[PDB]
Amino acid sequence: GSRARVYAEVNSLRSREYWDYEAHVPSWGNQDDYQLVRKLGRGKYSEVFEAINITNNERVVVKILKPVKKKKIKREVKILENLRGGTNIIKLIDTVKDPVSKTPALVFEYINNTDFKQLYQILTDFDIRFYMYELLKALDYCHSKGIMHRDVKPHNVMIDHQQKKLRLIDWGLAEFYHPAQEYNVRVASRYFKGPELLVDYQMYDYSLDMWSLGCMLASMIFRREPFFHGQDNYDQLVRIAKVLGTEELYGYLKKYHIDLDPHFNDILGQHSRKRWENFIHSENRHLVSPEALDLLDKLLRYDHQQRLTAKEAMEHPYFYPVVKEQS
Ligand SMILES: Brc1cc2[nH]nnc2nc1Br
Ligand SMILES: [Cl-]
Ligand SMILES: [Cl-]
Ligand code: NA
């Protein structure tokens, strides 16, 4: 079967307690120290608030969890505690419970983010390189810690464009990578799902996040957000195949012995692989360079095992201007 080219055995080389999140026993502090100020968002299993820690007057974010999902709560807590101190990973400050109802909540550092729909319209060439480099640091870190994020998308990459701070958030879908483990493919936002998920290939790895990152890079340099805009999960693969080509898709499926849902027969059609230069026009030409296209071409590949790792991406010439400035 398939396995990760990097970090494959990292969890098996650690203590079982590192990855055995079902056995994790969080230390639950008291939510009464936090005053909710404003609702920021809501999801299937959580609600998120700006809040003040009344004991030190610090602004924080509080994510209240539906208490029923106990295994999933332990998973997210253990992952966040394993990632503590990681570069550009949102900092978990506290794990707390309502002292009466025992409903759990996660307390995070606050970040004053610029909404990505507004931000992505004004980014410069250097800004894209800079923020992509910072996001890659977060993914290289979590991958090196044996963790797949599985929900990389603009909404989960919080950017304070005034202070130049980036944090990868929402670790509620993240999982530990173990070689040969078969994972649930119902992860990531539709537009950021790797082809492996869309063809029901369960033996995926950290390289899933690299597809999602490539999708973000393409949306930022080309100013088409989201870049692959499917109407459902079937159409999502069609949108990908329109660009990467159908014959290349079939070679991928053959290599991994992947059976294709026969509903694809009536919708995939026949598509050449397109040159990435086809996406350039006057509105995006200043964000596109040969080095951007070379990097993107090495991320948005069907074959998950041939996509760049986060580290290989960081090492690409596209980021040399950022590395030099950070000197
Ligand atoms: Br900070 C922060 C952390 C999160 N984790 N999951 N959702 C989140 N939202 C915000 Br805002
Ligand atoms: Cl899973
Ligand atoms: Cl297209
Ligand atoms: Na409280």
Q: Which atom of ligand 1 is nearest to the CA of 170?
A: 6
Strand, coil or helix: what is 31? helix
Q: Which atom of ligand 1 is nearest to the CA of 43?
A: 7
CB-neighbour burial class of residue 75 (10 A; exposed 0-12, middle 13-18, buried 19+): buried
Pairing of strands 175-176, 165-168: unpaired
After which residues does the chain become discontinuous at a C–N distance over 2.5 Å? none
> Angle at Cα 192 formed by Cα 66 and Cα 112, nearest 5°?
60
Locus of tokens 């977060």: 138
Within this chain, do residues 181 and 273 fall inside the same structural domain, yes or no?
yes
- Name the CA dihedral angle for 201, 1, 142, 313, rounded to a multiple of 10 degrees: -90
Contact indicator for 292, 221 with CB cutoff of 8 Å: yes
Query: Which one of 110, 126, 149 terminates a domain?
Result: 110
Contact indicator for 196, 204 with CB cutoff of 8 Å: yes
Within this chain, do residues 73 and 176 fall inside the same structural domain, yes or no?
no
Burial 82-98 (b: 16+ CB within 10 A, else e): bbeebebbbbbbbbbbe
Q: Distance from CA of residue 80 to its chain's centroid?
A: 14
C-alpha torsion sign, points 126, 239, 275, 247: positive
> Angle at Cα 22 formed by Cα 105 and Cα 80, nearest 5°?
45
Alpha carbons within 13 A on the beta-carbon side of 268: 20
Distance (Å, rounded) from C-alpha 198 to C-alpha 182?
15
Contact indicator for 105, 64 with CB cutoff of 8 Å: yes
Within this chain, do residues 11 and 48 fall inside the same structural domain, yes or no?
no
Within this chain, do residues 234 and 124 fall inside the same structural domain, yes or no?
yes
Within this chain, do residues 117 and 84 fall inside the same structural domain, yes or no?
no
Within this chain, do residues 132 and 249 fall inside the same structural domain, yes or no?
yes
Out of 36, 42, 61, give the residue to mutate to test ligand 1, the one with the largest number of ligand atoms within 8 Å of its CB: 61
Residue 304 tokens read as 């998950």
| Element housing 147 (H / E) | strand 147-148
Within this chain, do residues 106 and 179 fall inside the same structural domain, yes or no?
no
Q: How many domains does the chain have?
A: 2
Within this chain, do residues 83 and 142 fall inside the same structural domain, yes or no?
no
Out of 108, 152, 153, give the residue to mutate to test ligand 1, the one with the largest number of ligand atoms within 8 Å of its CB: 108
Within this chain, do residues 144 and 122 fall inside the same structural domain, yes or no?
yes
> Which of 263, 211, 259, 220 is CA-nearest to residue 238?
263
Distance (Å, rounded) from C-alpha 119 to C-alpha 112?
13
Ligand in nearest proximity to the CA of 71 = 2
Catalytic residue, from 151, 170, 205, 209: name it.
151
Q: Domain range for residue 70? A: 20-110
CB-neighbour burial class of residue 325 (10 A; exposed 0-12, middle 13-18, buried 19+): exposed
Pairing of strands 92-97, 29-30: parallel
Strand, coil or helix: what is 56? coil
Within this chain, do residues 147 and 30 fall inside the same structural domain, yes or no?
no
Annotated binding site for ATP: 40-48, 63
> Angle at Cα 275 formed by Cα 4 and Cα 200, nearest 5°?
35
62 lines ligand 1 (CB under 6 A): no
| CA distances for 170 relative to 31, 63, 122, 223, angstroms | 20, 10, 25, 24
Within this chain, do residues 209 and 64 fall inside the same structural domain, yes or no?
no
Locus of tokens 């109407």: 231
Active site residue 94: no
Considering all CA atoms of the chain, what is the largest pairwise distance in Å, rounded to the nearest integer?
63
Query: Which one of 110, 141, 166 terminates a domain?
Result: 110
Strand, coil or helix: what is 236? helix
Q: Which amino acid is at 185?
A: V
**Which residues is 63 bridged to in the sheet?**
48, 106
DSSP state of 57: T
Within this chain, do residues 98 and 219 fall inside the same structural domain, yes or no?
no
| Protein residue whose Cα sits closest to atom 10 of ligand 1 | 169
Q: Which amino acid is at 311?
A: K
Burial 46-55 (b: 16+ CB within 10 A, else e): bbbbbbbbee
Ligand 4 center to 174 CA (angstroms) = 27
63 lines ligand 1 (CB under 6 A): yes
- Radius of gyration of the chain, Cα coordinates, nearest whole angstrom: 20
> Which of 22, 26, 13, 315 is CA-nearest to residue 145?
13
Torsions phi, psi for 50 (to 5 deg):
-70, 145
This structure was determined by: X-ray
Q: Determine the number of helices (DSSP H) and then strands (DSSP E) in the chain.
A: 11, 10
Ligand in nearest proximity to the CA of 64 = 1
> Which of 142, 141, 162 is CA-nearest to residue 150?
142
| Element housing 62 (H / E) | strand 58-65
Query: Which one of 110, 138, 169 terminates a domain?
Result: 110
